[PDB]
Amino acid sequence: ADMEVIELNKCTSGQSFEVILKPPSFDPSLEEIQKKLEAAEERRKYQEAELLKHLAEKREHEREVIQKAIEENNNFIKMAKEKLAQKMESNKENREAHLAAMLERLQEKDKHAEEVRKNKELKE
Amino acid sequence: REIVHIQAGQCGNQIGAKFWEVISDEHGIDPTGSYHGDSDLQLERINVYYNEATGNKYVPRAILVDLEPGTMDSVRSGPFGQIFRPDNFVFGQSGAGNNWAKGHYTEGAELVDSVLDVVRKESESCDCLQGFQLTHSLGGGTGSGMGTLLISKIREEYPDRIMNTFSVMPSPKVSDTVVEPYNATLSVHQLVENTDETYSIDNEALYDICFRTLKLTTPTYGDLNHLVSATMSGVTTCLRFPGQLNADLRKLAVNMVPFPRLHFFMPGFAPLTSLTVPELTQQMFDSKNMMAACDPRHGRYLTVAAVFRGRMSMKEVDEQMLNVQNKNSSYFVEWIPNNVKTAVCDIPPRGLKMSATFIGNSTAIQELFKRISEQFTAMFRRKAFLHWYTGEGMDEMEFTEAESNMNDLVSEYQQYQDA
Amino acid sequence: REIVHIQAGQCGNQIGAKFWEVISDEHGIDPTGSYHGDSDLQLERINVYYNEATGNKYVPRAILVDLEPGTMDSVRSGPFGQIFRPDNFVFGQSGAGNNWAKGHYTEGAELVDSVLDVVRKESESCDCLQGFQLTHSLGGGTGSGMGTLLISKIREEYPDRIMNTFSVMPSPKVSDTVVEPYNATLSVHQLVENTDETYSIDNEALYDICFRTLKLTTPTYGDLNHLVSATMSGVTTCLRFPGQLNADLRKLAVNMVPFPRLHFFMPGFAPLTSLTVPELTQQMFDSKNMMAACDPRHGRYLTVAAVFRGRMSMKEVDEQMLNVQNKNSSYFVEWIPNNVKTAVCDIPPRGLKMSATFIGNSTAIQELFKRISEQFTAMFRRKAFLHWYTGEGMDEMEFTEAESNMNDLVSEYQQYQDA
Amino acid sequence: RECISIHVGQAGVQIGNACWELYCLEHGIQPDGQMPDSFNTFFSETGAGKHVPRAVFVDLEPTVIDEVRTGTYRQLFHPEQLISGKEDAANNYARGHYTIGKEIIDLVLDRVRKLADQCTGLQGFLVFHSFGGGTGSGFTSLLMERLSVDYGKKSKLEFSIYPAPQVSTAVVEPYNSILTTHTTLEHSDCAFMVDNEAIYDICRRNLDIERPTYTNLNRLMSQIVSSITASLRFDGALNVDLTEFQTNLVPYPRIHFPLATYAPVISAEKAYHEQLSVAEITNACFEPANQMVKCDPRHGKYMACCLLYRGDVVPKDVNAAIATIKTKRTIQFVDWCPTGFKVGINYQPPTVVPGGDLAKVQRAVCMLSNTTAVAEAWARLDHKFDLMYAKRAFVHWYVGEGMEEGEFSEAREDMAALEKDYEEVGA
Amino acid sequence: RECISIHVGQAGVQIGNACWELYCLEHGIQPDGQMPDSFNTFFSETGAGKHVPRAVFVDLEPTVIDEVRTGTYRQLFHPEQLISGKEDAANNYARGHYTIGKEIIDLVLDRVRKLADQCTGLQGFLVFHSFGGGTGSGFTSLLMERLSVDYGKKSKLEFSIYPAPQVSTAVVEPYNSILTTHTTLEHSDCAFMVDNEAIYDICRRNLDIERPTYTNLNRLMSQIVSSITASLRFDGALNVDLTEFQTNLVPYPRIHFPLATYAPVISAELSVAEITNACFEPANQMVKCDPRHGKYMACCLLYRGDVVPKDVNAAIATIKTKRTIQFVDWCPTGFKVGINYQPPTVVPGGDLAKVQRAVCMLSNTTAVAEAWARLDHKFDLMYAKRAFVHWYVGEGMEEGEFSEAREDMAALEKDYEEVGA
Ligand SMILES: CC[C@@H](C)[C@@H]([C@H](CC(=O)N1CCC[C@H]1[C@H](OC)[C@H](C)C(=O)NCCc1ccccc1)OC)N(C)C(=O)[C@@H](NC(=O)[C@H](C(C)C)N(C)C)C(C)C
Ligand SMILES: Nc1nc2c(ncn2[C@@H]2O[C@H](COP(=O)(O)OP(=O)(O)OP(=O)(O)O)[C@@H](O)[C@H]2O)c(=O)[nH]1
Ligand SMILES: Nc1nc2c(ncn2[C@@H]2O[C@H](COP(=O)(O)OP(=O)(O)OP(=O)(O)O)[C@@H](O)[C@H]2O)c(=O)[nH]1
Ligand SMILES: COc1cc2c(c(OC)c1OC)-c1ccc(OC)c(=O)cc1[C@@H](NC(C)=O)CC2
Ligand SMILES: COc1cc2c(c(OC)c1OC)-c1ccc(OC)c(=O)cc1[C@@H](NC(C)=O)CC2
Ligand SMILES: Nc1nc2c(ncn2[C@@H]2O[C@H](COP(=O)(O)OP(=O)(O)O)[C@@H](O)[C@H]2O)c(=O)[nH]1
Ligand SMILES: Nc1nc2c(ncn2[C@@H]2O[C@H](COP(=O)(O)OP(=O)(O)O)[C@@H](O)[C@H]2O)c(=O)[nH]1
Ligand SMILES: [Mg+2]
Ligand SMILES: [Mg+2]
Numbered sequence A: 001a002d003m004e005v006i007e008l009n010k011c012t013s014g015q016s017f018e019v020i021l022k023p024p025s026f027d028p029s030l031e032e033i034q035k036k037l038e039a040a041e042e043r044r045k046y047q048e049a050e051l052l053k054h055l056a057e058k059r060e061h062e063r064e065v066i067q068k069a070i071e072e073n074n075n076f077i078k079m080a081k082e083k084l085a086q087k088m089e090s091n092k093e094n095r096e097a098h099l100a101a102m103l104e105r106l107q108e109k110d111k112h113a114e115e116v117r118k119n120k121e122l123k124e
Numbered sequence B, C: 001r002e003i004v005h006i007q008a009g010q011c012g013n014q015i016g017a018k019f020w021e022v023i024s025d026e027h028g029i030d031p032t033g034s035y036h037g038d039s040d041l042q043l044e045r046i047n048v049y050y051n052e053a054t055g056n057k058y059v060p061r062a063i064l065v066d067l068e069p070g071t072m073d074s075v076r077s078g079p080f081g082q083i084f085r086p087d088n089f090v091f092g093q094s095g096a097g098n099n100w101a102k103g104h105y106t107e108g109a110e111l112v113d114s115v116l117d118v119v120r121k122e123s124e125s126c127d128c129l130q131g132f133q134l135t136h137s138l139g140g141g142t143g144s145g146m147g148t149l150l151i152s153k154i155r156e157e158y159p160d161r162i163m164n165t166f167s168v169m170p171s172p173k174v175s176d177t178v179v180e181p182y183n184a185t186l187s188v189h190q191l192v193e194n195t196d197e198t199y200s201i202d203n204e205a206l207y208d209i210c211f212r213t214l215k216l217t218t219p220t221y222g223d224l225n226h227l228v229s230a231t232m233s234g235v236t237t238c239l240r241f242p243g244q245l246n247a248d249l250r251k252l253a254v255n256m257v258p259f260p261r262l263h264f265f266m267p268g269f270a271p272l273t274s275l276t277v278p279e280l281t282q283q284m285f286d287s288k289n290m291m292a293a294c295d296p297r298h299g300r301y302l303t304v305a306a307v308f309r310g311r312m313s314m315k316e317v318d319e320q321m322l323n324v325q326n327k328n329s330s331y332f333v334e335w336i337p338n339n340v341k342t343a344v345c346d347i348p349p350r351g352l353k354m355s356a357t358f359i360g361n362s363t364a365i366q367e368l369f370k371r372i373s374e375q376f377t378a379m380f381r382r383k384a385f386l387h388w389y390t391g392e393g394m395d396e397m398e399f400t401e402a403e404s405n406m407n408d409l410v411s412e413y414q415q416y417q418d419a
Numbered sequence D: 001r002e003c004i005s006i007h008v009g010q011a012g013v014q015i016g017n018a019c020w021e022l023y024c025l026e027h028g029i030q031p032d033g034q035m036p037d038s039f040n041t042f043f044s045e046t047g048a049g050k051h052v053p054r055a056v057f058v059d060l061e062p063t064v065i066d067e068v069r070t071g072t073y074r075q076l077f078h079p080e081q082l083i084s085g086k087e088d089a090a091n092n093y094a095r096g097h098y099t100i101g102k103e104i105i106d107l108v109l110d111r112v113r114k115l116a117d118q119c120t121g122l123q124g125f126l127v128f129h130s131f132g133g134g135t136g137s138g139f140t141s142l143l144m145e146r147l148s149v150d151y152g153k154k155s156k157l158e159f160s161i162y163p164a165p166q167v168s169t170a171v172v173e174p175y176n177s178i179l180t181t182h183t184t185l186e187h188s189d190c191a192f193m194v195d196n197e198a199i200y201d202i203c204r205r206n207l208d209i210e211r212p213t214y215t216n217l218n219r220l221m222s223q224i225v226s227s228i229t230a231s232l233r234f235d236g237a238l239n240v241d242l243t244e245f246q247t248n249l250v251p252y253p254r255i256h257f258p259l260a261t262y263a264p265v266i267s268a269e270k271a272y273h274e275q276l277s278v279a280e281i282t283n284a285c286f287e288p289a290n291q292m293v294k295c296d297p298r299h300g301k302y303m304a305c306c307l308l309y310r311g312d313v314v315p316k317d318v319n320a321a322i323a324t325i326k327t328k329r330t331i332q333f334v335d336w337c338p339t340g341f342k343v344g345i346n347y348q349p350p351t352v353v354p355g356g357d358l359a360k361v362q363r364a365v366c367m368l369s370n371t372t373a374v375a376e377a378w379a380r381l382d383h384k385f386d387l388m389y390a391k392r393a394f395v396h397w398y399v400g401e402g403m404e405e406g407e408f409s410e411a412r413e414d415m416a417a418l419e420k421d422y423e424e425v426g427a
Numbered sequence E: 001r002e003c004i005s006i007h008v009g010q011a012g013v014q015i016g017n018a019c020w021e022l023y024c025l026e027h028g029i030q031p032d033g034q035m036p037d038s039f040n041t042f043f044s045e046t047g048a049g050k051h052v053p054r055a056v057f058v059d060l061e062p063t064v065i066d067e068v069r070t071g072t073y074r075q076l077f078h079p080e081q082l083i084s085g086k087e088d089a090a091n092n093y094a095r096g097h098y099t100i101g102k103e104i105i106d107l108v109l110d111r112v113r114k115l116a117d118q119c120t121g122l123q124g125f126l127v128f129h130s131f132g133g134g135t136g137s138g139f140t141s142l143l144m145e146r147l148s149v150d151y152g153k154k155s156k157l158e159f160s161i162y163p164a165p166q167v168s169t170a171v172v173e174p175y176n177s178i179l180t181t182h183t184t185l186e187h188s189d190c191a192f193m194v195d196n197e198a199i200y201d202i203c204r205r206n207l208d209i210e211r212p213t214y215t216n217l218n219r220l221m222s223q224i225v226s227s228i229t230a231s232l233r234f235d236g237a238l239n240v241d242l243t244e245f246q247t248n249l250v251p252y253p254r255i256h257f258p259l260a261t262y263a264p265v266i267s268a269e270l271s272v273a274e275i276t277n278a279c280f281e282p283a284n285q286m287v288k289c290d291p292r293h294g295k296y297m298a299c300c301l302l303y304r305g306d307v308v309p310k311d312v313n314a315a316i317a318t319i320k321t322k323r324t325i326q327f328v329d330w331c332p333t334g335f336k337v338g339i340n341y342q343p344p345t346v347v348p349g350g351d352l353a354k355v356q357r358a359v360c361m362l363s364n365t366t367a368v369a370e371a372w373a374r375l376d377h378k379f380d381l382m383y384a385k386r387a388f389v390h391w392y393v394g395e396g397m398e399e400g401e402f403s404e405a406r407e408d409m410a411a412l413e414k415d416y417e418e419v420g421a
Helices: A037-051 A062-080 A092-096 B009-027 B070-076 B100-104 B106-123 B142-154 B181-194 B203-209 B222-236 B250-256 B278-284 B314-324 B363-376 B387-393 B396-415 C009-027 C070-076 C100-104 C109-123 C142-157 C180-194 C203-211 C225-236 C250-256 C278-284 C314-324 C363-375 C387-393 C397-415 D009-027 D093-099 D101-117 D134-150 D173-185 D196-207 D214-234 D243-249 D278-282 D315-326 D372-389 D396-401 D405-423 E009-027 E093-099 E101-117 E134-150 E173-185 E196-207 E214-233 E272-277 E309-317 E366-383 E390-395 E399-417
Strands: A014-017 B003-008 B062-065 B131-137 B162-169 B197-202 B264-269 B301-309 B340-345 B355-362 C003-008 C063-065 C131-137 C162-169 C197-202 C264-269 C301-309 C340-345 C355-362 D003-008 D055-059 D082-084 D124-130 D155-161 D190-193 D302-311 D342-346 D368-371 E003-008 E055-059 E082-084 E124-130 E155-161 E190-193 E296-300 E302-305 E338-340 E362-365
Touching: A037 D093, A037 D396, A062 B106, A062 B387, A062 E134, B003 B009, B003 B106, B003 B142, B009 B062, B009 B070, B009 B131, B009 B142, B009 B162, B009 B222, B062 B106, B062 B142, B100 B106, B100 B142, B100 B181, B100 B387, B106 B142, B131 B142, B142 B162, B142 B181, B162 B181, B162 B203, B162 B222, B181 B363, B181 B396, B197 B203, B197 B222, B197 B250, B197 B363, B203 B222, B222 B264, B222 B301, B222 B355, B250 B301, B264 B363, B278 B314, B278 B355, B301 B314, B314 B340, B355 B363, B363 B396, C003 C009, C003 C109, C003 C142, C009 C063, C009 C070, C009 C131, C009 C142, C009 C162, C009 C225, C063 C109, C063 C142, C100 C142, C100 C180, C100 C387, C109 C142, C131 C142, C142 C162, C142 C180, C162 C180, C162 C225, C180 C363, C180 C397, C197 C203, C197 C225, C197 C250, C197 C363, C203 C225, C225 C264, C225 C301, C225 C355, C250 C301, C264 C363, C278 C314, C278 C355, C314 C340, C355 C363, C363 C397, D003 D009, D003 D101, D003 D134, D009 D055, D009 D124, D009 D134, D009 D155, D009 D214, D055 D101, D055 D134, D082 D101, D093 D101, D093 D134, D093 D173, D093 D396, D101 D134, D124 D134, D134 D155, D134 D173, D155 D243, D173 D372, D173 D405, D190 D243, D196 D214, D214 D302, D214 D342, D243 D302, D278 D315, D302 D315, D315 D342, D368 D372, D372 D405, E003 E009, E003 E101, E003 E134, E009 E055, E009 E124, E009 E134, E009 E155, E009 E214, E055 E101, E055 E134, E082 E101, E093 E101, E093 E134, E093 E173, E093 E390, E101 E134, E124 E134, E134 E155, E134 E173, E173 E366, E173 E399, E196 E214, E214 E302, E214 E338, E272 E309, E362 E366, E366 E399
Parallel strands: B003 B062, B003 B131, B131 B162, B162 B197, B197 B264, B301 B340, C003 C063, C003 C131, C131 C162, C162 C197, C197 C264, C301 C340, D003 D055, D003 D124, D055 D082, D124 D155, D155 D190, D302 D342, E003 E055, E003 E124, E055 E082, E124 E155, E155 E190, E302 E338
Antiparallel strands: A014 D342, B264 B355, B301 B355, C264 C355, C301 C355, D302 D368, E296 E362
């Protein structure tokens, strides 16, 4: 269904029309932010200028712990060269005027042995 | 869109030699020569793993790194030994140590540059490089040590790009060496920070897999090495072939990891050794079948991905997958909506007219990590062989930073069993 | 590595003539000539006692010192009289005295130089000279007097090198004087200061050995001299033969003398006169068998050494020795751990297919020294004959210095019977 | 009177690609662009011989756009109108709208400017894009922001592919959808959603194609898209110009989302059966089964209806069809509205792709409806979002590229608002 | 990857002398040095024809070194690599480290410098020396001091003959041992003790040789030494590498002292498992002691010959479950197992027979400080009366050097006990 048809536009190669069937019943854009397009760009150059000089960090700790090693082997060398210079000398000194400590036995029982054949020269 | 590949040391190198011996096969490349394959597809994505060269010829994108000639001269001879650019070889000449410090710091740094210098020329000479993937032992020295570093060095010279690793997390069974716990604990801290996805290949799982189910009595470093090799195959695949998705691998990463904490995937395979499809799923989703020694049970899944291979209709694949998650409802997370994705590819592998491979981001992996953080404090306890690294120029508490970090990780895995 | 040898005076000389007549035999040397022996070893260490000469010929390393022609012309004629280099003879021409002063001071010094000048040429013409050994009477004059000096003179011209003496400590039973006590006491002080090891050969013991066991009626200076001779043999031996130890003789010294006070060894022999091995030990370790008149009993051992001769197995030797110390536990010191060492050599002596000789550093020797420091103060309780030396140009109290030193020594021997 | 298509990102592209293929067949243009009504709506009679689409194509990874300048039609487009961007957006809106969008946006915008520079009174834009997915959500959204500046009035019509579990999505998807929608919304005038799932369900059922290709689905959408734009390529009353769309589909400026049912979809090899009655096609328009966004209006209320018939048809019947739905189905209009039905008849018979899976028909209807139950579809998207976001799910992956924790907030904000407006137009 | 042997003093020398003998037979080099894997670890292919060991020999008295350039192998070595010092050290450490060492130390050090000068990346030293005994304690100690200077990193492995009552010692012995140990210690990376007594005990029992020669004992040690170094001589893809065998053997920087059990010793004229099972054997140890008493911290089996891991692991399994296990408090329970396909070649004249396979068990056990005490107790009670002390104070030593060494000894004796639980 029971129709009534409004006519709107008969045309070369088509038609249109409404078919109202039952009454109804009762009752900017902003160019602005390509600036926030620049906000992201911003907080990623930071995001990364983090992990960067944070990884430039995680190196030259590296370069540090390499050296805190060679730098700790040199400690073991010019610590224990003198465990040897003050031993192979606390030694050749401990003896070299200490075996000659054995010669004050000799130039003694010698300057006495001569000294009492000087007693025999005591029959003149 | 393009990816260069790093292999580092004894395990890292042998793993890859049998990785390239498979993909080179499926594409069809002689030891040196270019193509020979009655298929056609292949060469779509051959791009992604092959910077090609003189004549027709194909040379893989491969950086070979080790700190002792040894295992590298073991590849130049043998498999597709001829294939890699002989200038893509970096020998170490000195010791490895089997000690993480030598690898990451002293005997390591020493080389780094001359591999850094090569990844550069290869990557800086791709055309829209997508990322790096690298293989390595996770305990032990050169691989684990120099690796962790190399990737820590790669980041920075590449922020931007994504980091992919296959890591063989080492076990008490199959190789002793009072130390790995240390090397591993140290590296695990290290991965967690530098990479975007890592694949935990547990040797414990690997050899328990050749035994509890396979009856291979005295397992080679070979077979077992052959297992990873074929798991490497199917984990890539859509990376290297298809016409389905297209897989930025970043597209992977950004989809399989809800939490920045590069979560470590446990892999696993279809028909094992050296096939109905139902029977190919209940195998792939079975715990006796995972490349990481965990029973995904005590531990639910976050995200899962599975890629199937060969002549079979995605009719039963659709509904066999969209099945598993009902005859096991509460073992995939409630709050990540469509977190198990499947992909179909129809060009077969080694033998096999049918094969699934599986990638799971599961908190079951907490189990794998806890146990190494425990061989750890069972030594770092009474400050054990620590002296091998105190002496190398490392600090006492730089172990406590990585036990105190690895424990943090185990804790997130735990926390996430939520509302 | 090389050792020159001194003989001085009546006893010192005859002792050596019968020392050289035995070692020359065991090596196999004619009166003059070189070798004649169906053995082969010998010439390994012949070096050590034989500076060799023109043709093949062997001439002993021998310095011969005496202060009267007498006993020296007694050797040129007789035994292996020819053997010694005729320029190695130093005659004295005047009296000996039988008085220690003449020997160490007046008629002695007189000669010293022309023997000091010879030990030089022979030592300074060895090639890695090791030490000197000298023989002598300990009472009596030339031997004891000039000796003490010669060694007091050798030290100094050689600090360094070690000093070895056989000393015949003289007795009331069988002696040609009343004075010896003086000469000996004066010399014993003198040894204690200058030498590194001395062998106390008590004549009391020697003749008591030809009597209490041997029934040898009227003993010549011949036999009894023959005993020392063969005891000299086995005391060296490892010095002059083997393939066991090697014996620096300083190696000896530094091992047999805990205390700087050149402790004097008492010797002793195996089969006596002119053999099961058990019966060879309990003989060697029996007091009736020691060349020094002491009963090692009142007096424990510090260190002991025994060298065995002839083909017999070190099976029973090992355990016979490591026996004696159990059937006699408390008579070897508690605090010097392995203080009895044995050496095996398998080339026989005079007759004898079996022979042990024994060297003991025992405080039993205190007994031997006390008794002479008692003949002494039984005479220096009198300025008795003192006037023979007062007159020679010596002081009264230079006797008291050596009584007062000989008593000090007897006191250490005593003190050491400790915790 | 001049009309520019923009297709952005994988979906956008492929959907387009294969429906300019149908426009050409319809207007009888050979692939090389030559041919032996007016349809100038969509092509420029450039130089002598050739025809060129009034289109741009933008993807951030070659591949898709690439195989366009690969597969015959190679010729159709001018070198410059396909833009392609080296690096993928990786399935995330952050990248599209901000990080990688920024790069190519200024070039794109210049090339659309170019096709318009040469239009004496351009009237609009037909933006074609995916709902989830990297560049489809992001670039679009960036695009539509900018276009709203350079071309204030000029209508923007979006065709959107609302995604579904089984024509493959991806976890993060729901984020992206919710995300763009919010931005895009206050910029886009009218928007035809297309449930992938609905489409896929039509094939599985009506065509027997067991596991459908993209290309399989895409054809269907091709048909539907034509059957909309049809109006403004041939000229003959109703949606003659783009303005006429608002007038007829949106009562309420909140960009509303019309639902397209489509006439007979019947697999060739059926071709030669008895063609169906004017009435029967109509009667399948009022059909859950035949919808194009999974939902239903025995549940929701209408506020704008509109039938688009193609072929030889006569009003007299179109009517006595409409007649026995009024007394055969669920009438169902909103408290304060007529019970509309602007009917569009176009005499031109429905042409279809020879290779294809569907058969030549005789007449086909097209029912565009604005119904409130389309917010069934807004909820199923929201719920996903809400419960993922309930644990920051993947959020970081965006916070990374430069986004705000609170952009995610202040979009789902908007989403809950619309979800009410829709329910808030119910009596 | 290049590896220098130093043998010092009677023992050092004789031990070595008769295990380069074994190396040669193993690598099939004829005495004159000529011959018709890599083994370059230990030889330099010098000139065309000859091979020359990578070794120095130092004694302070000829004799021993002398009968080297006397007895075929006359040829092996270059004239200059055997150093010899005219005057003995007389069994006392003062001499070796100070008095007579001083003299020859500087020449020695130059000649090792010469064999390393010719090595593109030398990696270490195998120092061979006696525990007691003049030049063995003393010169070694001096050597190792200096070497630590000239070659900081480069490993020093010492092989030590801990001495015993009946393969003859000498009173003062104990002093010398305690003495060098202390100095040597903070310079030496890892040290393999060899109880002479143990060795001697193996012969008397397993070989029947009633009263064994030096050369008798020495063969045994030769075998044991080989089976260690075996590793870095040739290859065999299955293991090898001492480098990182040590890794386990020394947990704790105090130079630790591994204990060498050896496989089958059976007189000329057995299952994979059986040989193993005699490694866990008091009877078959190589320092008199026992680990039913002490605790393990590092274990390590060195198989030689035709062996299969199949066989090796199933013998390892049931070693953990019917025997005394013994792994301390805080270790993996390890077992670094190394197989070297190359079969165990033995000396033709010698007393042992050709085998087929031979194990070698290296263990770091706490009960090895049983051996540190038996040495200390001797020292303590001698010194308790200055014993012989003077003989050293003479050559130039200090009353307090003797103190400040026994000091150290009592500390280590505790560390070992202090890795208790
Ligand atoms: C855990 C290692 C394991 C896989 C093998 C062994 C080692 C090996 O590498 N092999 C076997 C022969 C050659 C080689 C491989 O065969 C295919 C192959 C050549 C390879 O891929 N090699 C790696 C490259 C390399 C070459 C040269 C030097 C170094 C490395 O593989 C069989 N092996 C000896 C063991 O497992 C051994 N393990 C054990 O004894 C136990 C374990 C298992 C409980 N210890 C840890 C105590 C044995 C006894 C079972
Ligand atoms: N109907 C249909 N849906 C598609 C098509 N391609 C992608 N989609 C859907 O749109 C979503 C993915 O969006 P895409 O356009 O692929 O992503 P993009 O970033 O826009 O494109 P890429 O840069 O290539 O990643 C998923 O829900 C898919 O189901 C297509 O060709 N046809
Ligand atoms: N196993 C073994 N032990 C020996 C050998 N030679 C000596 N010894 C032991 O080592 C200690 C003696 O050390 P030596 O090497 O002889 O003394 P040295 O100073 O180094 O050498 P010399 O200068 O000849 O005295 C004693 O414990 C002996 O048991 C040997 O050839 N084999
Ligand atoms: C090698 O290339 C792959 C790349 C990706 C995925 C994947 O797993 C099937 C791959 O294979 C290993 C992938 C993953 C995971 C998801 O999480 C469940 C997802 O939603 C979605 C996907 C993939 N997308 C689709 C539509 O299936 C995109 C990323
Ligand atoms: C002639 O050469 C000799 C040289 C020495 C010793 C010895 O007595 C058996 C000699 O024979 C007389 C010697 C001595 C004594 C010891 O004190 C018990 C010792 O331990 C050790 C020894 C000898 N060494 C050994 C290992 O028996 C070395 C010094
Ligand atoms: N599955 C696998 N694991 C290996 C292989 N080689 C070593 N590993 C494991 O990784 C650890 C040591 O790795 P390694 O490669 O020697 O370290 P590298 O010296 O850095 O190359 C061992 O404990 C093994 O568990 C390999 O062939 N395959
Ligand atoms: N056993 C031994 N003792 C002797 C010999 N000649 C002398 N004596 C002892 O030494 C003391 C005197 O020695 P003598 O050689 O005459 O002194 P000299 O004048 O210096 O040579 C005597 O009391 C004897 O006890 C000797 O031929 N053999
Ligand atoms: Mg995208
Ligand atoms: Mg010595």
